[PDB]
Design a protein around this ligand. Structure first.
Ligand SMILES: Nc1nc(Nc2ccc(S(N)(=O)=O)cc2)sc1C(=O)Nc1cc(F)cc(F)c1
Length: 282
């Protein structure tokens, strides 16, 4: 805009590009998101009053020249970049644990306020020098709809469910947790069906036993290949059993059986959680 000095383009978005900018008056540095209904307008208002240490703060909302700008507090780096930077050595387990614990707190907060993220991915998880990690880009969907990454998409979404629950965010976080641990995306599909089948090849093709109602889903086909489930010990090898048991609950096929963020925070895996400081290269 005119009140902001676009410093640099710090990425993209499913609705617009995000820039690093300085408030030419208050000297503050922010992340400015330029968006290309009304329920969306009011829904954005809900987000503005959604304040939590693990949620990127939405500072200002500017609707002018029939265009929409969102001003967010600026964070130092995203998790995708950090994971890449940590690929040779891996992110230390205590930090992986700290990040997961914090994201679950953020999700528990959002979910308790009936807010769904819907598109969690490393690129929209932001970190700072003090060890915090925060949820950014709440998809702003449900009030916004109709290359895109499908790697973290929950199976019920892939199978055509139109009304998904808070459980889809737990699935995405589970995929991210695995990736931090193995330094490899868990389900790197390149199409909706490839995404779906990679999930099936690893967790087994779901059936009515493990997922009641699955065969009645919009996009379910009796013709899907029937793959046997693999052992978690081979899925995320370096992870101890507490970690694997938590991951398994975050990746249950049935949205109803999938662990809630609140219940996840009480899992034994977090008994020894701490808040280490990451080594960030900015
Ligand atoms: N507040 C904020 N700070 C950011 N910082 C930042 C991100 C990546 C790097 S990197 N690539 O590691 O150098 C550095 C700094 S992105 C961002 C945001 O809200 N982003 C944002 C907001 C939306 F509304 C939708 C969306 F997809 C993203």
């Amino acid at each position: 805009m005119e009140n902001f000095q676009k410093v640099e383009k710090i990425g993209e978005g499913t609705y617009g590009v995000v820039y690093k900018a300085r408030n030419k008056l208050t000297g503050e540095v922010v992340a400015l998101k330029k968006i290309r209904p009304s329920t969306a307008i009011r829904e954005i208002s809900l987000l503005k009053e959604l304040n939590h240490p693990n949620i990127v703060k939405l500072l200002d909302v500017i609707h002018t020249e029939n265009k929409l700008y969102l001003v967010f507090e600026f964070l130092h780096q995203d998790l995708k970049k950090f994971m890449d930077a940590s690929a040779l050595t891996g992110i230390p387990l205590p930090l992986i644990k700290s990040y997961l614990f914090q994201l679950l707190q953020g999700l528990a907060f959002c979910h308790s306020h009936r807010v769904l993220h819907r598109d969690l991915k490393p690129q929209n998880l932001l970190i700072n020098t003090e060890g915090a990690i925060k949820l950014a880009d709440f998809g702003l969907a449900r009030a916004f709809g109709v290359v895109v990454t499908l790697w973290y998409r929950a199976p019920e979404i892939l199978l055509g469910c139109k009304y998904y629950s808070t459980a889809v965010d737990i699935w995405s976080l589970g995929c991210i947790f695995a990736e931090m641990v193995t330094r490899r995306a868990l389900f790197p599909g390149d199409s909706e069906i490839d995404q779906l089948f990679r999930i099936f090849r690893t967790l087994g093709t779901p059936d009515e036993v493990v997922w009641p109602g699955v065969t009645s889903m919009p996009d379910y086909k009796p013709s899907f290949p029937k793959w046997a489930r693999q052992d978690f010990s081979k899925v995320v090898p370096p992870l101890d059993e507490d970690g694997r048991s938590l991951l398994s609950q975050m990746l249950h096929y049935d949205p109803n059986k999938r662990i809630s963020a609140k219940a996840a925070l009480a899992h034994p895996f977090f008994q020894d959680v701490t808040k280490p400081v990451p080594h960030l290269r900015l």
